[PDB]
């Protein structure tokens, strides 16, 4: 990347490692998980690191296990502004044949609905765990080979481990490492026109298929043409200097100008798109401090404080109830409050004195003496001390 390294060093990509020996990096080829991403209005990413857009409004098949049928994902897409070139996600449906042949639905809130039933988070069933992440974003976790991300305002993500190498089919491609084959219709042939690909994965015949995927919605709103330039001009500004050599910014810039001219309010459409790039930079190692009072710093409530890179392990009051559980989480970004304070259910965070206990789930007040004939139990400080 235009900088020198001594021999013997072992720099590491996110996927694997590489070592300098005789001016030649040696490298493994071992697989590593892929990600199909939805965001913006209609900007998609394949497993094989393709980018495109398909502003179709129907229940399309996002992804699916295709040699067996461990799961299947179905986006549902909607027009999302006065403009015709503004089609964002409403909801996504997930289907687990492995458990009940149930049907999970991710709702435009942070809400989820299983089989029509609204459900509290966490949702420990046998395999799938559904809990908030920052308390503003849902995360499904089926087994170990699957993740999801919040489909509230439509930023759906996935994590497919390499066990699914090449055996998926949908909008998101094969997950085979090949970026070129990705427009492969269900009838088994690569289509050069995106307008052919997405409409082949709708689930309803009544859905009109489109004919042209416009590139410049800014034409139909000439007012925003000026603004759309300077707005994501910061994307290439040296504010993001540290991860130009981590991921190609040029599409994320392209995906900005489609969104800001398209949506109703370009304020957040801008600042959701910039976070789109920062999230990818962070997913490779590089965090960026790109928030300002002008550049859309969120407003953590008075109980909370903004934080750049922190540990979502010791935050919730539940953690004191289940301390033994592992928290193999990253250094995440969001609204925390200082370490003396732990998060309470009511949006405030509190010291651990009045931090209730969640024994059997049951929300015991901080002082609850509590016992059968045979057991003997109390809630001290967030932990539930049982005996016999």
């Amino acid at each position: 990347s235009g900088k020198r390294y001594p021999p013997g060093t072992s720099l590491s990509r996110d996927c694997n490692t590489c070592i300098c020996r005789n001016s030649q990096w040696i490298c493994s080829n071992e697989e590593c998980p892929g990600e199909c991403l939805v965001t913006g209005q209609s900007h998609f990413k394949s497993f094989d690191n393709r980018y495109f857009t398909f502003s179709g409004i129907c229940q399309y098949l996002l992804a699916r296990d295709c040699q067996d049928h461990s799961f299947s994902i179905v986006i549902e897409t909607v027009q999302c502004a006065d403009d015709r070139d503004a089609v964002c996600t409403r909801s996504v449906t997930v289907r687990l044949p492995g458990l009940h042949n149930s049907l999970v639905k991710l709702k435009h809130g942070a809400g989820v609905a299983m089989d029509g039933q609204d459900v509290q988070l966490p949702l420990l069933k046998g395999d799938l765990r559904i809990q908030h992440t920052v308390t503003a974003s849902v995360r499904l976790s089926y087994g170990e080979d699957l993740q999801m991300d919040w489909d509230g305002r439509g930023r759906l993500l996935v994590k497919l481990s390499p066990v699914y190498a090449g055996k998926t089919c949908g909008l998101c491609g094969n997950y085979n490492g090949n970026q070129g084959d990705d427009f492969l219709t269900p009838s088994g042939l690569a289509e050069p026109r995106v307008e052919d690909f997405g409409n082949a994965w709708k689930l309803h015949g009544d859905c009109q298929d489109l004919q042209k995927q416009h590139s410049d919605p800014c034409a139909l709103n000439p007012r925003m043409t000026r603004f759309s330039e300077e707005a994501c001009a910061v994307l290439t500004s040296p504010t993001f200097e540290a991860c130009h050599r981590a991921v190609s910014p040029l599409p994320y810039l392209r995906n900005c100008r489609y969104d800001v001219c398209s949506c109703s309010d370009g304020r957040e459409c801008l600042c959701g798109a910039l976070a789109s790039y920062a999230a990818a930079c962070a997913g490779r190692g590089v965090r960026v401090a790109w928030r300002e009072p002008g550049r859309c710093e969120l407003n953590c409530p008075k109980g909370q404080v903004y934080l750049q890179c922190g540990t979502p392990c010791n935050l919730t009051c539940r953690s004191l109830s289940y301390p033994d559980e592992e928290c193999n989480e990253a250094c995440l970004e969001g609204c925390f409050c200082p370490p003396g304070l732990y998060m309470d259910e009511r949006g405030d965070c509190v010291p651990k004195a009045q931090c209730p206990c969640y024994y059997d789930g049951e929300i015991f007040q901080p002082e609850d003496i509590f016992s059968d004939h045979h057991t003997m139990c109390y809630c001290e400080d967030g932990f539930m001390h049982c005996t016999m």
Partner: protein, 478 residues
């Protein structure tokens, strides 16, 4: 109410089965293999299980067509994509497995299309390894190179130089013509076809080069290699996202660092990481001009290209159009715009889509001067959309391995009974060709090759310069 048609029967949601997949999961031919959601059915009238809906018609059999490009195909109908046929037997397309012949390209001044297909930007000024065979653990037969000068910014400058190193030879080209600095050993495979606007140039069984006389470099490799090469065109493996494997054997994300790994002179000036923007230098803060250039590149999406747009994405080729001609000033000969279109038009021709997009008020391309040397204008040289490249001549009477179907340019058209020779510009009767047929068999017009090296006792050599029915004596080793 309405009693639905006879060919199908009404359904009712049972009160027990949550799986009331009735009207909502109306299976058409598209969504049959696709799995559907359903809360409950409706009071609709759905086809029997043995059939589906088909455009307001419950087509009975599972014979309903196999779509491609949003178009019908009956079962049994075939489609030709690339060098493969492909039939839809039941409902999915069933294709062959003949991998086709890939093709590098230099569309404009500084852009590069890989074999597997990867446009990327790389303004360079040093000499670079376009493609070679000497890659890792191979013999290293051919070493096609490229060298540009004053070509970081596209303009009327940037005359390319190309030096191609095969069979221990040194033949190179620039400035309109080709030059042999060192002839190679096996002259038999050597071949040059100056036809139309191109210099078609074979070098062997599985190698061919094409040159537009101006900038473009379209080398064509056969099925032989299949990951035996590397350079700026990638590896030719089919994998499309591993074409940026630098010479130090690691994928790079930023192509400007990539091609720096492939420069020959390891001490010249490596290029500079440009800040990324949608506007080149001229179009930078020149929004007025920036629209006029934009509209002009929309010929790539015009009524005349509508056939080819469905096959080949114009979007890659558009990006080059806008990039070059902003940077280019296009004062005199405005080829820094005309060429980018011609590049797309030829790719269209390779897929069988000849196009006539060239008018008198846009990139005219006259052909009158060849019909000048004779005092009387016989008028045989006519410019033509895409006339075939591999014909027979006095110099090349035999048919040649023809990597390119047809090509643009001036093409001498005259009635039959006359074969073209380039020295005497017109076409001429066949007998006037200095053609050679020694001891009966049909071959070329006296190639300058010493046949029969293998057996000394059978060293029965017969050259032919132009016409002579001669045979030379072999010098004995003893």
């Amino acid at each position: 109410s309405l009693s639905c048609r006879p060919p199908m029967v009404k359904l009712v949601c049972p009160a027990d089965n949550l799986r009331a997949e009735g009207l909502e999961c109306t299976k058409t031919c598209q969504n049959y293999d696709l799995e559907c959601m359903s809360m409950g059915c409706v009071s609709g009238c759905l086809c029997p299980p043995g059939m589906v809906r088909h455009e307001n018609r419950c087509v009975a059999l599972e014979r309903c067509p196999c779509f491609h490009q949003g178009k019908e195909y009956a079962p049994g109908e075939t489609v030709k994509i690339g060098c493969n046929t492909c039939v839809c037997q039941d409902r999915k397309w069933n294709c062959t497995d003949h991998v086709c012949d890939a093709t590098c390209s230099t569309i404009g001044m500084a852009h590069y299309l890989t074999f597997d297909g990867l446009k990327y930007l790389f303004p360079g000024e040093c000499q670079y390894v376009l493609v070679q065979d000497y890659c890792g653990s191979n013999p290293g037969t051919f070493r096609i190179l490229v060298g540009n000068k004053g070509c970081s910014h596209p303009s009327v400058k940037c005359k390319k130089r190309v030096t191609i190193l095969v069979e221990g030879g040194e033949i190179e080209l620039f400035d309109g013509e080709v030059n042999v600095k060192r002839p190679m050993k096996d002259e038999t495979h050597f071949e040059v076809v100056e036809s139309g606007r191109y210099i078609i140039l074979l070098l062997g069984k599985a190698l061919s080069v094409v040159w537009d006389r101006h900038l473009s470099i379209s080398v064509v490799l056969k099925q032989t290699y299949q990951e035996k090469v590397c350079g700026l065109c990638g590896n030719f493996d089919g994998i499309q996202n591993n074409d940026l494997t630098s010479s130090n054997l690691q994928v790079e994300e930023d192509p400007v660092d990539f091609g720096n790994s492939w420069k020959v002179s390891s001490q010249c000036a490596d290029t500079r990481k440009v800040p990324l923007d949608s506007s080149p230098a001229t179009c930078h803060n020149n929004i007025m001009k920036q629209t006029m250039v934009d509209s002009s590149c929309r010929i790539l999406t015009s009524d005349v290209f509508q056939d080819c747009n469905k096959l080949v994405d114009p979007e890659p080729y558009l990006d080059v159009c806008i990039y070059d001609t902003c940077s280019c000033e296009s004062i005199g000969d405005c080829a820094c715009f005309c060429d980018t279109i011609a590049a797309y038009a030829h790719v269209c021709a390779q897929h069988g889509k000849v196009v006539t997009w060239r008018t008198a008020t846009l990139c005219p391309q006259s052909c009158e001067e060849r019909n000048l040397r004779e005092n009387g204008y016989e008028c045989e040289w006519r410019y033509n959309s895409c006339a075939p490249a591999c014909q027979v001549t006095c110099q090349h009477p035999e048919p040649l391995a023809c990597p390119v179907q047809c090509v643009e340019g001036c093409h001498a058209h005259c009635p039959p009974g006359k074969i073209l020779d380039e020295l005497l510009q017109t076409c001429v009767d066949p007998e006037d060709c200095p053609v050679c047929e020694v001891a009966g068999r049909r071959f070329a017009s006296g190639k300058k090759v010493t046949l029969n090296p293998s057996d000394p006792e059978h060293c029965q050599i017969c050259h032919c310069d132009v016409v002579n029915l001669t045979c030379e004596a072999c010098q004995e080793p003893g």
